[PDB]
Nucleic acid binder design. Structure first.
Lengths: 39, 264, 50, 215, 220, 80, 444, 68, 69
RNA sequence: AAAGGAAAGGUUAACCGCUAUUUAAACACAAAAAA
RNA sequence: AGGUAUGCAGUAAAA
RNA sequence: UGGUUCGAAAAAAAAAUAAAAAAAAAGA
RNA sequence: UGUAACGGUACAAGCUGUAAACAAAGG
């Protein structure tokens, strides 16, 4: 039910294609300390 | 160096089956026991209270039962005494044992006093006779007694080897297609009549084929086992209470001598 | 001869013929009563568990 | 080595990762790389609280990469080294299945390395003879009675979905024809239990003659 | 009355169907026969044997054990023959029609005796076991008699391809046989074996204790 | 040497030692050995993971690339 | 050192026999775990002496003393009746926590003092808004265990649990639902509400170890809704591996009850789940030793004297039959004792009614004996034989088991004392009959 | 051993005429693997024997080419 | 040799209890000699001097002498 | 005859020790103070 | 003839 | 199934280990 | 102080401590 989250959407996921894997792999910047200090 | 033990014992035992059979012989028939017959009786005092009290209260009986000579003692239980002795006989036995214990306690601490000595002598002789009526020369173990009564002899063990029952009456769901020799032991030390011993098949023997692989050819007591050993009209309930100088067999009836029995 | 006999018996097993054996006199190749000694040992173990 | 787990965490640092095994794993099982110092209770609570997984069992092994000697390349330094890290391999058994393509490895280059196909018919080590303890159904307590198929309640529940007669599950290409019980035959062919049927006639018990010279 | 509820009747009918299927399978060999295959097929059990068991329960002929092979040798009931579902299965399935025709043809009318049962058994043509002459023969037993050893050594390449010979032509086995016969003196149709039927239909069988807590060891 | 940490063997472990060697890896204790070879477990000693309700949370692991431009402009407008 | 050869051989044989004895001894220990768990987070951190004078005890002290005595098995009648007297004196001043611990002690020790529960229940009802999960669970649990039935208060406790659903512990809620089902205190609306809440509790808050406690055949048959039944039966197939014989037994009984009384639900199940339960029916589920009671033995003796073959205390399917006749197997008897009804009443328990209905619908002709009527016969055997004969001469009992006449605690106590006296007399005159008493010694 | 700490290289400094091939044991192992694959419908031996770029569906080969 | 040949044994218990870390500590030997897998007192230089371009906020020199809470 | 085991644990006995103590698990069941 | 399944103290006897 | 643990019985200490982290107000 | 074991980092004779190369823009 929830253990699938360890591989869902990653390159280990067997139910999705290469383009979807690449799209899921794209990522942005890490949280800066300045913005983290506001939380 | 190793700490393996139990099922991982590092001891290299022999696997030779003949040597292991010899080991069985040494471990069971030739085993050495430190305790004595009175040690066993004391261990079972709670179940054999009356005989324990008699042994400890009657002069000379303990000395006789502590001697080196290999002996066999048939110990009745308090339950056996209560069931088989008449109420008056049981009351008399209890009173006399208590009397001997009371005299012993007095030692620890006219004609009326003189009669005490005579009564003590009479009670001591009677209770000594009773207790020693169960002591038998030699060491007669349970398997020896069975083999003497003939169990284990292919020519005589009939009626004890192939017991069967009406199976469908007790395990019906498995039977849909059916739903449609007296040995003699030396006399007791206090008497001259040798003791008869025999064997019978228990009620549990017939049910063996229902639950075991068999190779057959073409009230009732609840004591366990397939064979029942009877000694002088009394059933052995617990046998092979081995000691250093003998063996104790537990029985369900006291072997009262004819002299102590009442003719009328 | 052992090889020949084994071949024949295995051939019958493969074919699915009834599980029959030669019934004649089997020679005794051992001296020890291992069957009965081991049976006695098993009896003792069962009694201990009980 | 790893920091000991506090009574209250508030910020777990432990990384649970999926491990691709070259051996076979059952339907409802998955292998994870985990820190060595964690207990089964810790692993189960971690998975149930951070992921909501319904864990049934956790089994653990400690994996230490083997020693390796650098001997091969040009100008080799004959020094010892280990590839990877020591870790706890946690095999978790859950209420639901896990994809084989996720849990196990595959290959079309070395065709023999397909554990999802070969299953437990192969041992993936130097082990030659596989040891398996008796199954739960083969045990006695909570095991399958070999005459329960003849009882009323099982037949009431079977309906038309199941047929309980074991005679229907006999493999024709393995079993032999029935023999005559009055003639020499093997016990292993069709009995498959540890007792002698009464329909087999009386058998001769032979006791060895150990001292023929005496007679 | 005779029944307290539909589930009661359903349980009794299911038990009767299981008993009938067991009896028919044992009649036809319990395996290795196309008749056994058909009796095992789910559709046959669902339709034909279900109707047959219902008919038996209605007829009040609930017999248990080895005494129930009468049911297996009786002809299929006319109610079973006339049930529309049976006819649909017969039309759609060649095996079902073949099996039902065989059952109708090879049956004992009186069961609807032993001579008729023998005739039907012969008609069934269930394969029978046969003990082979090869297993009746003998081959030399080590230790070999010196003449046997010597002859086999001299004729290794001819006599050791098939060493089986009729009883009495092998001295090693003949001597052992004679010794065993002397020790015995000093001391003093082929039919496949079958385990007896363990199923039943009668109340005596259905409502008997399961005896699963008791420790019965001879499970069967 | 033929025994010890030499030749890449490293510190001793129960895997490499004979039966009887006792060496763990750093797990917490969760009970007490008994006098007869048993071990009584106490679940009160199991660490308690503190996990907040992650359902319906708008935060994500990373931040969108435009945040840099937005924040830089919003801070320059103040600095200037 | 060295030994003499005989000594060498004897001691070597002893060592070998000891090894074999150890191996034989460990054979049957499949379910012996060296690692074992003990629960101790309910033990209070305060210290108490259980024998202290009750007049110096308050609620906080007496509750702790009761719970400690229950844990330590210090079942002393004088001590616990002093506990009862002091608790009834302090009824006005107990918190829900203290009342919960008191109920835990009483139920755990099975101290069947009905008066204490009766006197404490009104305060429980009044203080319900302040109760918490553990206290509610404990009150229901103790009442169910001791057979003290108060349907109104049990329903109020269940409603309070529903109102505090966001605060209730899943195990406590499961136990409360099971107790409500066993006591038959939930009308249809409350049953539907409890089923609706339990569905979500099990789906969202309970893992396998917590869920397996929800598998109770009485609740499945009488309380759970159809979706809850389907979910429970499906989930047991997944959670079987962590279950024990009691859980397997209750799952099997639930499946049989659904099949016999709810064929529509049984069919609404899936083929795989039905296959799981069919295969479960084939397993040897470890039971526990059962023996005829004194009343059971008396009824068997009277029946045998009448002349009816029968068998006692045997297992058929997933049920235990008191008496099963041999000549006509469908005829069976049940001997109903004081604990088969609710205290001070002749009303049957839900489990008893469910078993009666299921066996009756599966075909058994059931007849029943009531101890309240049997005790009035005394030691007479002719009267008991006539009673059993007259019962035999009459039709079997319906598939629906109806309750008996009204009774009171006074009559219950009187009948219990009479049964004690009858037991004593029968045992005495059995053993005396056994004893021969024929050896007379001329010792005097 | 794999770390090459043993002295097993000492014998390899001397010639030997040949070495046992353990073909019985190795063939038993290989056939066990083949059976494990074949029960699932895979012809591992055929795959291993296929030529580069050769496609053979089912149990086919040069004989199929001859008779088709 | 006589009978079965016996040579120096490889015994982990003996080696670790007679020549291990603590056993070497208890021995009376030259402890100023470098030992790769055991106790020795050939002391090192510690962390070297910071290069002029490194960040002093990250340069580190002490572990135990400054250990706070 | 060369003269051979007793520590811890289990059993039985005795017992005015103790949550350093058997599920807030469950089954079964004519069953029990004072008055 | 080491210790077996609520566990810590603690005396005696012993197939 | 063993080790661990009690005993034998041991600082007679297997460096990177533990029923072994400052040791009861523990918030039931 | 010094050194080392494991772990992270280009699976390392460097760096480094589960925050394992970096916070410098806080009521």
């Amino acid at each position: 039910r929830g253990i699938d989250e360890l591989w869902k959407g990653s390159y280990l996921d067997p139910t999705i294609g290469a383009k979807q894997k690449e799209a899921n792999a794209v990522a942005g910047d890490a949280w800066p300390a300045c913005l983290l200090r506001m939380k | 160096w190793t700490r393996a033990s139990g099922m991982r014992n590092p001891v290299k035992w022999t696997r030779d089956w003949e040597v292991l059979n010899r080991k069985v012989y040494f471990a069971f028939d030739e085993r050495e026991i430190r305790r004595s017959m009175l040690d066993a009786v004391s261990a079972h005092r709670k179940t054999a209270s009356l005989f324990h009290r008699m042994i400890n209260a009657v002069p000379g009986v303990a000395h006789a039962m502590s001697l080196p000579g290999p002996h066999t003692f048939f110990l009745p239980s308090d339950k056996a005494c209560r069931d088989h002795l008449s109420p008056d006989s049981l009351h008399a036995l209890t009173e006399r044992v208590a009397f001997l214990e009371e005299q012993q306690r007095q030692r620890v601490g006219g004609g009326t006093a003189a009669a005490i000595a005579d009564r003590v002598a009479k009670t001591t002789e009677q209770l000594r006779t009773f207790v020693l009526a169960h002591l038998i020369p030699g060491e007669w173990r349970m398997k020896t007694l069975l083999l003497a009564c003939g169990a284990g002899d292919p020519r005589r063990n009939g009626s004890l080897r192939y017991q069967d029952t009406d199976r469908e009456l007790f395990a019906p769901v498995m039977y849909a297609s059916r739903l449609g020799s007296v040995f003699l032991l030396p006399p007791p030390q206090s008497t001259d009549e040798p003791l008869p011993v025999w064997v019978q098949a228990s009620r549990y023997a017939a049910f063996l084929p229902i639950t075991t692989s068999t190779n057959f050819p073409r009230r009732r007591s609840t004591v366990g086992g397939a064979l029942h050993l009877w000694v002088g009209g009394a059933l052995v309930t617990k046998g092979d209470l081995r000691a250093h100088n003998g063996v104790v067999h537990m029985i369900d009836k006291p072997l009262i001598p004819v002299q102590l029995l009442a003719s009328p | 001869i052992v090889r020949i006999r084994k071949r024949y018996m295995g051939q019958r097993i493969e074919a699915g013929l009834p599980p029959y054996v030669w019934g004649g006199p089997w020679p005794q190749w051992g001296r020890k009563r291992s069957l009965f000694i081991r049976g006695e040992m098993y009896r003792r173990m069962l009694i201990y568990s009980f | 080595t790893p920091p000991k787990t506090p009574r209250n965490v508030f910020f777990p640092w432990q990384v649970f990762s999926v491990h691709r095994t070259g051996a076979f794993l059952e339907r409802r099982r998955v292998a994870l790389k985990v820190p060595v110092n964690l207990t089964k209770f810790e692993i189960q609570s971690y998975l149930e609280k951070i992921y909501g997984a319904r864990v049934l069992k956790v089994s653990t092994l400690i994996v230490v990469p083997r020693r390796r000697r650098d001997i091969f390349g040009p100008r080799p330094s004959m020094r010892y080294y280990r590839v990877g890290c020591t870790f706890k391999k946690a095999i978790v058994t859950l209420e639901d299945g896990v994809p084989d393509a996720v849990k196990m490895l595959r290959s079309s280059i070395e065709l023999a390395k397909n554990p999802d196909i070969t299953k437990h018919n192969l041992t993936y080590s130097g082990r030659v003879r596989a040891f398996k303890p008796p199954s739960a159904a083969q045990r006695w307590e909570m095991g399958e009675s070999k005459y329960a198929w003849r009882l009323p309640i099982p037949n009431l529940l079977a309906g038309d979905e199941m047929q309980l007669n074991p005679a229907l599950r006999i493999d024709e290409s393995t079993t032999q024809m029935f023999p005559d019980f009055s003639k020499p035959f093997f016990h292993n062919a069709h009995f498959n239990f540890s007792w002698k049927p009464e329909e087999v006639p009386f058998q001769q018990t032979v006791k060895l003659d150990i001292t023929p010279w005496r007679r | 009355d005779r029944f307290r509820s539909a589930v009661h009747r359903e349980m009794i009918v299911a038990m009767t169907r299981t008993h009938l299927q067991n009896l028919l399978l044992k009649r036809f060999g319990t395996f290795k026969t196309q008749e056994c295959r058909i009796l095992a097929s789910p559709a046959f059990s669902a339709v034909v044997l279900k109707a047959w068991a219902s008919a038996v329960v209605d007829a009040n002929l609930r017999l248990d054990g080895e005494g129930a092979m009468r049911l297996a040798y009786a002809p299929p009931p006319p109610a079973v023959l006339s049930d529309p579902k049976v006819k649909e299965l017969v039309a759609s399935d060649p095996e079902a029609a073949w099996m039902l025709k065989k059952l109708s043809c090879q049956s004992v009318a009186s069961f609807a005796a032993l001579e008729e049962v023998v005739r039907v058994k012969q008609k069934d043509n269930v394969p029978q076991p046969h003990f082979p002459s090869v297993l009746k023969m003998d081959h030399p037993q080590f230790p070999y008699e010196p003449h046997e050893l010597e002859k086999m050594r001299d004729l290794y390449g001819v006599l050791l391809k098939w060493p089986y010979r009729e009883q009495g032509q092998v001295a090693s086995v003949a001597a052992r046989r004679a010794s065993l016969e002397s020790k015995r003196e000093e001391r003093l149709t082929e039919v496949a074996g079958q385990l007896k039927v363990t199923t039943g239909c009668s109340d005596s069988y259905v409502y008997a204790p399961s005896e699963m807590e008791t420790g019965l060891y001879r499970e069967h | 040497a033929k025994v010890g940490p030499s030749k890449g063997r490293g510190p001793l472990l129960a895997k490499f030692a004979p039966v009887g060697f006792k060496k763990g890896f750093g797990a917490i204790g969760l009970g007490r050995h008994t006098k007869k070879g048993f071990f009584i477990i106490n679940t009160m000693l199991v660490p308690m993971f503190k996990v907040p309700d992650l359902s319906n949370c708008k935060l994500k692991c990373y931040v969108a690339p435009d945040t840099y431009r937005i924040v830089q402009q919003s801070f320059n407008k103040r600095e200037l | 050192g060295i030994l003499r050869p005989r000594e060498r051989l004897l001691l070597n044989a002893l060592k070998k026999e000891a090894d074999i004895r150890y191996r034989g001894r460990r054979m049957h220990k499949r379910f012996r775990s060296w690692a074992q768990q003990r629960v101790r987070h309910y033990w209070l951190p305060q210290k108490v002496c259980v024998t202290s004078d009750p007049q110096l005890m308050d609620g906080s002290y007496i509750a702790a003393c009761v719970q400690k005595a229950a844990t330590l098995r210090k079942h002393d009648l004088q001590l616990w009746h002093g506990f009862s007297k002091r608790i009834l004196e302090l009824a006005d001043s107990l918190t829900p926590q203290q009342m919960g611990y008191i109920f835990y002690g009483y139920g755990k020790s099975l101290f069947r003092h009905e008066e204490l529960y009766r006197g404490l229940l009104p305060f429980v009802a009044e203080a319900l808004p302040e109760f918490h999960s553990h206290a509610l669970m404990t009150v229901a649990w103790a009442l169910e265990r001791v057979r003290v039935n108060d349907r109104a208060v049990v329903a109020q406790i269940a409603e309070e649990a529903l109102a505090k659903k966001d605060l209730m512990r899943p195990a406590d809620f499961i136990k409360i639902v099971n107790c409500v089902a066993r006591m038959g205190a939930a009308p249809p609306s409350l049953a539907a509400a409890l089923s609706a809440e339990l569905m979500r509790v099990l789906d969202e808050k309970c893992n396998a170890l917590l869920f397996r406690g929800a598998v109770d055949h009485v609740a499945v048959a009488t309380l759970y809704s159809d979706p809850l039944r389907l979910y429970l039966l499906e989930r047991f197939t997944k959670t079987a591996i962590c279950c024990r014989p009691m859980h397997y037994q209750k799952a099997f009984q639930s499946a049989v009850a659904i099949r016999v009384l709810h064929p529509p639900v049984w069919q609404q199940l899936s083929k795989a789940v039905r296959n799981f339960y069919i295969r479960l029916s084939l397993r040897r589920i470890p039971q526990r030793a059962r023996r005829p009671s004194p009343l059971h033995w008396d009824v068997s003796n009277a029946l045998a004297k009448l002349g009816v073959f029968h068998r006692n205390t045997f297992q058929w399917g997933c049920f235990w039959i008191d008496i099963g006749e041999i000549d006509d197997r469908r005829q069976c008897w049940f001997v109903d004792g004081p604990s088969d009804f609710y205290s001070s009443t002749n009303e049957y328990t839900e489990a008893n009614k469910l078993q009666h209905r299921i066996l009756s619908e599966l075909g058994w002709n059931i007849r029943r004996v009531r101890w309240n009527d049997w005790v009035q016969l005394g030691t007479d055997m002719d009267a008991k034989v006539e009673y059993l004969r007259k019962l035999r001469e009459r039709p079997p009992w319906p598939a629906i088991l109806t309750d008996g006449p009204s009774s009171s605690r006074q009559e219950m106590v009187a009948n219990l004392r009479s049964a004690r006296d009858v037991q004593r007399a029968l045992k005495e005159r059995r053993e005396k009959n056994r004893q021969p008493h024929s050896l007379v010694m001329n010792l005097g | 051993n794999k770390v090459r700490t043993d002295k097993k290289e000492r014998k390899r400094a001397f010639p030997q005429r040949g070495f046992w091939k353990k073909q019985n044991f190795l063939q038993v192992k290989n056939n066990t693997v083949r059976l494990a694959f074949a029960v699932q419908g895979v012809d591992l031996l055929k795959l291993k024997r296929l030529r580069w770029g050769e496609v053979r569906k089912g149990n086919t080969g040069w004989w199929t080419d001859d008779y088709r | 040799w006589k009978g079965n040949w016996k040579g120096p044994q490889r015994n982990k218990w003996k080696w670790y209890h007679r020549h291990g870390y603590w056993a070497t500590r208890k021995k009376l030997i030259d402890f100023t000699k470098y030992r790769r897998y055991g106790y020795h007192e050939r002391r090192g230089l510690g962390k070297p001097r910071m290069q002029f371009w490194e960040d002093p906020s990250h340069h580190k020199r002490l572990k135990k002498s400054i250990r706070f809470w």
